[PDB]
Amino acid sequence: PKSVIIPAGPFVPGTLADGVVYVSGTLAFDQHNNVLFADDPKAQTRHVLETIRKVIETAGGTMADVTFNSIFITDWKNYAAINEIYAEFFPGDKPARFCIQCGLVKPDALVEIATIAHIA
Amino acid sequence: LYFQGHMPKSVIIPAGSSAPLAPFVPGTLADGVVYVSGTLAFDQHNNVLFADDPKAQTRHVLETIRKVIETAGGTMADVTFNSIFITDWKNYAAINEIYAEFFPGDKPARFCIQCGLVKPDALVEIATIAHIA
Amino acid sequence: GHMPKSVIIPAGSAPFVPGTLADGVVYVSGTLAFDQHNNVLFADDPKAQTRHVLETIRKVIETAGGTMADVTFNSIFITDWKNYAAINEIYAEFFPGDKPARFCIQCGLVKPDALVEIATIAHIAK
Numbered sequence: 199p200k201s202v203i204i205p206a207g208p209f210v211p212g213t214l215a216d217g218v219v220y221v222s223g224t225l226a227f228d229q230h231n232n233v234l235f236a237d238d239p240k241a242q243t244r245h246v247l248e249t250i251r252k253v254i255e256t257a258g259g260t261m262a263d264v265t266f267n268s269i270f271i272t273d274w275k276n277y278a279a280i281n282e283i284y285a286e287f288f289p290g291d292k293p294a295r296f297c298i299q300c301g302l303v304k305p306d307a308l309v310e311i312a313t314i315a316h317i318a
Numbered sequence: 319l320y321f322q323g324h325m326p327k328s329v330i331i332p333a334g335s336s337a338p339l340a341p342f343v344p345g346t347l348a349d350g351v352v353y354v355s356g357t358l359a360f361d362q363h364n365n366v367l368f369a370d371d372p373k374a375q376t377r378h379v380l381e382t383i384r385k386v387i388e389t390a391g392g393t394m395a396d397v398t399f400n401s402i403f404i405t406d407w408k409n410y411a412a413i414n415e416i417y418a419e420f421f422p423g424d425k426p427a428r429f430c431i432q433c434g435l436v437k438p439d440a441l442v443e444i445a446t447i448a449h450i451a
Numbered sequence: 452g453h454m455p456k457s458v459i460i461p462a463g464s465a466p467f468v469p470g471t472l473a474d475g476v477v478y479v480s481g482t483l484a485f486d487q488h489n490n491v492l493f494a495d496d497p498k499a500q501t502r503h504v505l506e507t508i509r510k511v512i513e514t515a516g517g518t519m520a521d522v523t524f525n526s527i528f529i530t531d532w533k534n535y536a537a538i539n540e541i542y543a544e545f546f547p548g549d550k551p552a553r554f555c556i557q558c559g560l561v562k563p564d565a566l567v568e569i570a571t572i573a574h575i576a577k
Contacts, residue, residue: 200398200424200449208418209428213398215449216350217452217474220399223429265456265471266478270431274561285466291458295467296481296570298528299559301432303407312429316473318452324576327523329549340535341543346523346552348574349475353524356554403556434557436532445554 205256212253214317219263221253221313223270225302233306239276242308243283250313251287259317262290268312269297280309325349332385336362339436345386350451352390356403356443357382358435366439372409375441376416383446384420392450394420401445402430413442461514470511475577477521479511481528481570483560491564497534500566501541508571509545517575519545527555528568538567 203212203219212221226234226242235241251261271280277297285292302310320326330345330352338344338355345354359367359375368374384394404413410430418425435443452474459470459477470479484492484500493499509519529538535555543550560568 199395202424208414208425210425213427215398220427222427262455265473281466288466291456292466292468294471294478294480297561303430310429316452316456326520327549327574340539341546341550342553343550348523353552355552436555
């Protein structure tokens, strides 16, 4: 049966089943679910990927285990900035991904990422 | 193929499910993993039920998703991830309230985004992954 | 899981790869109808875009060692419901016999002329 993954600190941050980690769509939220870094896509992207990494790590994996990222943005003018930070977190062989533009849960949010990883 | 060990995916079509709006099945099952198609609050003949009622639409959607997962041999507790699509954030609270009812105990991972849906009266759509073997 | 994921980059073809393979599962990136310079081919033709996209996806899956019949799920993104029937018509040609599960939603895509984008999950022999 699935394990939930809740790093020290109606969905959980991630789940683990049969060696597959599913990380929830993650935004740049403070502890009160307010958006951090309102007008700054680079710092939002960094905060998101740091959270995702901690979920995967809590499960026993690393970012190299990520097979797929689902990226959701609100403006294509931010794509270059988001990509720049994203690449820093995946230095080796890159995951597969999509990046689509849509609406996100809070008005200041500029990016959200959900992630699938295969761990040992 | 099947005789060689690579068992093909099984399509999952619950007893009574009606004709789909496009070329897809209610769900697929391969190697113990169930992929449920994006599910909307459709009647037979693919009209949207409960036009201005996001709670009733969410309930109908999760009942359908549950039947797919049960037909495949699992339960809602096996769901690892849900992809939720909505048209209006004013409905988020209502959708969440019903959603919670269907996943008592440890909750799945999920996302929820706002986008366009295949019919104008549709307020919510959900796709689902479940590990059942 | 102990063995790292394999990237799938078919001979001849931003920080992603066309697909990954791990434990018999192929994740194909969201694929659009791009030429060699990342311009959208077939600007006002959703059918020809869809065909190009599904041929790309097929080649990724084949490079990984599978076929389209191994596809378990497709995520489809479109810009205009007026194009839904057309996209569906071409989609069906690529999955004869038991169809995958899928979703189709309307959203924004990376280039204005893109009319469809598809990402795919497949379970291949292993």
